[PDB]
Amino acid sequence: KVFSKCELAHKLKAQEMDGFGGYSLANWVCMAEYESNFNTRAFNGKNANGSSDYGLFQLNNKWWCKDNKRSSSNACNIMCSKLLDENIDDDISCAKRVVRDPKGMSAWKAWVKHCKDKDLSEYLASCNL
């Protein structure tokens, strides 16, 4: 499915992502638009090696989920396919475990390029949804 901005802010806040990893809701939401366009069917596969990114947060198969191709692992304990879904609870648990590594939200290239250094002070202004 595709969330609107605020839709997703309702849903992530709902789950305590709001101060999570020492990052605010705005951060998390901004990462989801530039990583996936708020769509739970975002998938990007690139064979340098069998890597591919899954879902709303674009969680990569080499470390974070288990699927059939080589470069898979499973820290989150999920089958990557649980990230192709309407439900984003597994996606929530795996983002939560990801931000907790030393890279923090820098594990997400689109956030680095698109939200880090932006003033997000008024990014959810129209969403106290």
From Swiss-Prot:
Gene3D superfamilies reported in the protein's UniProt record: 1.10.530.10
PROSITE patterns, sorted: GLYCOSYL_HYDROL_F22_1 (PS00128), GLYCOSYL_HYDROL_F22_2 (PS51348)
The keyword RNA-binding belongs to this UniProt entry's keyword annotation: no
Cofactor(s) listed in the protein's UniProt record: Ca(2+)
Coiled-coil zones: none
Segments crossing the lipid bilayer: none
Domain C-type lysozyme: 1-129
Active site: 35, 53
Cystine pairs: 6-127, 30-115, 65-80, 76-94
GO MF annotations in UniProt: lysozyme activity; metal ion binding
Keyword Calcium found: yes
Enzyme class of the recorded protein, top EC level: hydrolase
Catalytic activity: Hydrolysis of (1->4)-beta-linkages between N-acetylmuramic acid and N-acetyl-D-glucosamine residues in a peptidoglycan and between N-acetyl-D-glucosamine residues in chitodextrins
Annotated residues for binding of Ca(2+): 82, 85, 87, 90-91
Cross-referenced InterPro entries: Glyco_hydro_22 (IPR001916), Glyco_hydro_22_CS (IPR019799), Glyco_hydro_22_lys (IPR000974), Lysozyme-like_dom_sf (IPR023346)
Catalytic activity, EC: 3.2.1.17
Cofactor note: Binds 1 Ca(2+) ion per subunit.
UniProt keywords, alphabetically: Antimicrobial, Bacteriolytic enzyme, Calcium, Disulfide bond, Glycosidase, Hydrolase, Metal-binding
GO biological process: defense response to bacterium; killing of cells of another organism
Function: Lysozymes have primarily a bacteriolytic function; those in tissues and body fluids are associated with the monocyte-macrophage system and enhance the activity of immunoagents.
Note: Lysozyme C is capable of both hydrolysis and transglycosylation; it also shows a slight esterase activity. It acts rapidly on both peptide-substituted and unsubstituted peptidoglycan, and slowly on chitin oligosaccharides.
PANTHER family per the UniProt record, alphabetical: LYSOZYME C (PTHR11407), LYSOZYME C, MILK ISOZYME (PTHR11407:SF69)
Family membership: Belongs to the glycosyl hydrolase 22 family.
The protein's assembly and partners: Monomer.
The protein's name: Lysozyme C, milk isozyme
Origin species: Equus caballus (Horse)
Gene that this polypeptide is encoded by: LYZ
